[model samples]
Target: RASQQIPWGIKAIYNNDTLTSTTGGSGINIAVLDTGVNTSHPDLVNNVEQCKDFTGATTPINNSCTDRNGHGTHVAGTALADGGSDQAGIYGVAPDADLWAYKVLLDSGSGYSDDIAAAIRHAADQATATGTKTIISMSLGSSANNSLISSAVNYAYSKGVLIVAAAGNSGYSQGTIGYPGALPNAIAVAALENVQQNGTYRVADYSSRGYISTAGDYVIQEGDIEISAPGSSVYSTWYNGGYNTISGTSMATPHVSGLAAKIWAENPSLSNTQLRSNLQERAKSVDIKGGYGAAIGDDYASGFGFARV
Candidate 1:
């Protein structure tokens, strides 16, 4: 069935079909900050290392770690789905990477910045306490900036956590990207669509665009787009042990985050900053075309172009 096959996004990035036979991303941990994750999902169960909630509800769903709205589960699956024990299920970008599920968003998919900030700090703390490489994958964002979240992002960066966030679904005309993503410490990812399913990608129409500093400088600044990844119609594990395809910069964020995990695992000595730069450096450039929103060199739409494995 479709759920048993690897998604196109994974192949587009050259992750390969034989991921199960490799280390994939053994030692790295990806902290998925979203609605929560369905830890029992066959494709995800083996990779889940921890699950927690910061929504501050008296009666949290599934003890605060299980996904109720499905967003977090999807995001987590994109980053690190294990294809189940028999290897007959779907695969993610980094199948063996450890997932630290953080339910910062409520069941309704709405959340406050305070809760998000608290969760960020907690992820950073755990990363430090365990002396493990952790990547913060936030498939959530806001148009408005919050000082608390910014501080938390900075704190996480200081503690050697790589923060990757969605660039939001607002199109270019919207004129602003989302916070936390807009923060300098975080790597903001835009959504790239496989226009023909032939490995040709373009910036998705709904992918948020960053502000250009000057006419043609192309130098990245705060609130500017950092990278792009497959997001449109990408399939992955969903809630209730099912699978679904969703589109958003939210989906793109995990691809990059998972790539970060894989790259970090391959280069165990690189620091967080080095890993971030390595991703950007390894991205293949996309040309400016009539139907595409990308530019030759880091324009407002697709920052560095499609991030690859």
Candidate 2:
């Protein structure tokens, strides 16, 4: 029964019915920093706890936290969409995890860095004040660097919040990983596409590549990729109480975020830093297989490799 509702992205992480049934990331709060979410979506309504808008629009919808562009809704669904009543809807990686919808981006899918920074800080502060385990999931990025957002990421990390972000959809070019994700404090995730419904996966053409320090050292550096996940043609919940299939590094970021929440929930005593290390260490390496940016061992292509449960 769970197999039918579990999407390929969830399967790619090796999530099974036992794991999902036992631990759906309960008590973990994932703060989705994107275009707001459709708080009324059936699969999401039960999990959404708070909604806030940082877009600063003069006239906001649902207090500026309602999703108008649908990107945030899709990303949020990937992280923590619980099947609706009667189990007739799709299940996300961490279906029981709590969601804190933060609209850092506007309806146009664009916003200022200051707005994003403020949302990050707010998530961290909320987690600290409430003593709740929080994870910030960001599926947006830019090639340009903003000190404000970087500072906010650092602050969140210090506050024991785990941050995950997209590498970008800039194709196979090196150094195309966007800011915030490229920031050292956040986990930057690349996109991997499942090949023909078989078990194999490869880096997608549109997935951005990171900058290697030198030719073979392979030591990770700032702006380098940290992990990869199912991103191509991902099917997840969308706005208006529907589902949609989309492709982008944006889709991949939340898979890792959801996995982090799941792992954190299982190991309640692990700190944010320890959880990060556990995810990295548990990642399964993707051997080079005649595809774009495929390499062994922490190359610019797939960081530690595809993140797994």
Candidate 3:
């Protein structure tokens, strides 16, 4: 799909906003833990950090992380591209942040919890070894939580690394949330759509919800979501010198990761928890038409509404 089936007013909100420079994610290092990325892809190569491979197969560390599917590139592009002319057909949320990638999931979309945990630990340590501040932006998840994963996330957090992930996208009505993304400290992002039927302030049916009653404070809990940038139709460099359009909340998580970079750029001293809180604190409120949407002012559902940058 070229755009979301619903709406979140992403295009206009992202392109027209002045805050782009205020928190443009410049100089910050953000990592994407997914099925490797095409680091050499024109849209992202310039910003990719030297990465380590962890997908269990043994891709050379020199070319450690690369995309088998274009998903990683798309996520990286949204979070860290240098951006392009409005006419260039693509751009990222930070447009200035740097990338540190790891291939936790192999080309087959299969990986073990151990691999992901190792990837997180390695990335965090790599940042320390290189003397650069790092932020972790993961767009992958599982149906259940893993202590090893939580330990990895917490380990990264303890090292001042910020982990941002996607909440589950399976909720059609009642309730839904995802693992690692739903972890207490990681900034868990949810997807929404700005639809014509409900205007630009509504969420899509499949977007995940923040289950405060269940997840409670266990969720990273952006006091409010910084802002939901364009998740759907987000364009970026692709594999093997090619490109295509696709949609999913998986597409939505990177916006938060990219935005996290911007926020860190703006206030490098802010702790990971503080950075997430600042984003949510600045989120814009919208209508709640569907049964799945969050409440107007504040609620666990939309986590202070969509990100606003």
Candidate 4:
């Protein structure tokens, strides 16, 4: 069976965000860091502002955001995809948010830890470069914890950039979480696989577990859900007016990103750090699995709880 891709659960955020703003992520910037977004795709044609290609491949930075493998596109769609009346295939958690995409991963969906570390800085810092733009979403990550990269993540947070990284898909087999995610500052996210089964949510077997004590181990951390959002079996738009489904902790990170965008848009005055704390503190404890498989929440499988849109 084909694995369904997860998306942001904005309905929860939209109707009940703490702030009562008319706009949702209007001025915020989201950096999409993956294989790259489809800059040429109709959905994202005008959304791109600062595009860079670090793939070392033939594709230039300008052309790199263009989706070819559907990974970045899937992640991007969840975070800041524009809205249409029909809402056809899908839309973003904060469709109105600004998109600043970076191509750190190559076409093969791989990049070095150093590039990943630099990306955190690049996304958080205000660019002095003429063409670069602020990042809106950063969807890629590295393995385990590295002090240097962890420091970079903290720098980004201090700069008022809210980073949401994947908790890594290796949790199912007992492995250290992806780097940056294990960091103390990064808003690390774990996937909550769900099925579109007649509108009811069923946890997927493939989703990874949350960190235990922030120790990079796949154990359930107490009171650390930071909050969960829908990352299970979400359907969304794709390159060339098509659609596809995919999943991973990578897929879940954007839900948190979009959630942050919505909250930020509602309260533009909130600092990045403040927003992170707010979201984590307000997370509801639901009947979700956790603890390296098993049910959800409280266990290492689902962490804190299943993702909350």
Candidate 5:
């Protein structure tokens, strides 16, 4: 059965007038390194060009590249669901962009450090060879530091891949941002609730903030978040030809991912650093007057405010 679901999150970004004629992100390749995607889903079938499994488990579910746990499909739909002539409402920021899925996480929503590193390196290498602009959007993370994953992230950046990651679901006093998201050159995204009964937009209470750069902190939280977006109660594609509402930095990361893809499509000559800078420069500053997040440039929580289209 075909369906349609309008996402207020996208509307919020579009209201800022940030998106251009290249809203569909034509010709860009966005690699979603997560739990895998539901290739059969109506909204995603056309958008998914390829899928790979790296969980290293033996069973059919663990051994396959399908989203057994569902998280990855949701993330994928938010970034590149097919909102074609037959389908509407459930549109993604870059619906026309190519989506390459890499299952680095398992059905249980967890995976080893080695698999993640491998995926990053692989996507980077693919981009280099194909000469296609690639963006890596990871909606998963871990608290423990992995030198391998960190190094892989560095390698991807150097190879000219734009990386966007979830800052994590860990709450306010979590000591520091989670792995991969806190890695250098990765554009880390924070969660922002569209609005509440109070009729005002606010950052999700559970969204983690800032890298722990203290004398006695978890690896010293030094870096600030890069940007924030609609994360809470977000509606997106689900497994087995369905849709659902979910919330987390996971949902927010893809919004920025699609935006990055669109920008790259419009400005193909931009370097990886320039790609990131333009996203930041175009973001509409969020009002966090009483909040501890950066008041001027990079807010501790909201970063440079809400991410634009």
Candidate 6:
């Protein structure tokens, strides 16, 4: 069901991400690589088609695709929430996109790089085998640049799977955007401020930004933000048949993930790189009114402006 009104956060980033009435990311597959997803949620259950676990638990708690914490649920909802029966106004970015769960983080809210890379590899293989438009949305990441995770992201990008990740939440300006998002092959996403504060939008205070370089040598390798999206106090689905508001680059990553599904579903012939470029190209420019907003064009705080549908 279409929402009565799109959330301000979703509207700001994509600037009408739905665009035409015909697009809802129908054929695209969005593999949410996170803690897990609660597939029973009303707005999300219909689109959940696949599940995998790498958290290494004997029972379904560790084995099945269920969110022990609310992180995955929130991320998944922002990407594909269909505005279930009760929350008709809280629809997701791409309501019809196929949502798959790849649980890597356990209940403790932490995961190893090997396990994260394993899920990424699985998604990569599936995308290649299917030859269909696929994307991996990762809201969870770390400060350490693990080679395994980088290689896994590269492998997925090579196989035509769009990898989008959250810029870390350290609120720093230099070399702070986290691992997988910092990889050149992945789309690093920063968070923009929500409209709750006088309906104005700007770079989020906690959003990570800028180039990441090694400790010893200043050879910058990665961490240029590909895009930014609304994140502060953004509302979406939560665990156990509820809804709530959360913030971070984590919340912003799914906006691009859903937008990616819409862009790819609308034009399946475009290459993954082309779509990545499309995301940057179609972004809506923000104007600096008074001293509040920054100038239009790519800034370190908000890259390529906000993403568009």
TM-scores of the candidates are 0.92, 0.91, 0.83, 0.77, 0.87, 0.86
User: Considering only N, C-alpha and C atoms within 3 Å, which residue pairs clash in candidate 5?
Assistant: 5-89, 5-90, 211-221, 212-220, 212-221, 213-220, 213-221, 293-300, 294-299, 294-300
Clashing pairs in 1: none
Candidate 4 is scored at a TM of 0.77
Model 2: how far residue 33 lies from native, Å: 0.5
Which tens-of-lDDT digit does each residue in 190-290 have in candidate 5?
88876542233566777877743431221213345777777888888877667888999999999899888878888889988898888877754444322
lDDT tens per residue, model 1, 1-309: 344466777877763645333337889999999989998998899998988888876422234586888899999988998778977777788888999998989899988888899889989999999999999999988889899999999999999999999999988653568888888899998887777433446778888878756313544567778878888988988878889888898899998999999999999889998998888777645432212455566667777666676
By TM-score, is 1 or 3 better?
1
Q: Which is the better candidate, 2 or 4, if ranked by lDDT?
A: 2
Q: For model 2, state the Cα shift of residue 242 in Å.
A: 1.0
Cα distance off (Å), candidate 6, residue 304 = 1.5
- lDDT to native, each model: 0.82, 0.82, 0.64, 0.58, 0.75, 0.75
Residue pairs in steric clash, candidate 6? none
lDDT of 3 by residue, 217-248 (tens): 32334222223334455455566644556566
Ranking by TM-score: 1, 2, 5, 6, 3, 4
All-Cα superposition RMSD per candidate: 2.8, 3.1, 4.4, 5.7, 4.3, 4.6
Off by over 4 Å in 4: 1-23, 57-64, 84-89, 127-136, 173-176, 195-203, 211-225, 285-299, 306-309
Candidate 1, superposed: residue stretches over 4 Å from native:
15-23, 57-63, 196-200, 214-219, 284-293
The TM-score of candidate 6 is: 0.86
Q: Model 6 RMSD to the real structure?
A: 4.6
| Per-residue alpha-carbon lDDT of candidate 2 for residues 1-309, written as tens digits (9 for 90 to 100) | 232467777777764533332137899999999989999888888899989888775422234588888899999989998887657777788888999999988788888898899899999999999999999999999999899999999999999999999999996977788988888889989888876222346888888888767313433458888888889988888877788888999999999999999999989889998999888877644432323666656667677777786
Which parts of model 5 have CA positions greater than 4 angstroms off? 1-4, 16-22, 57-64, 196-200, 211-222, 284-297
- For candidate 4, write residues 146-260 as lDDT tens digits: 6667787777766667767776665565344565665556666666543433233433455444545443232323223243456655565565555676777776787778778
The best candidate in terms of lDDT: 2
Count clashes in each candidate, considering only residues at least 3 apart in sequence or on different chains.
0, 0, 16, 36, 10, 0
lDDT of 4: 0.58
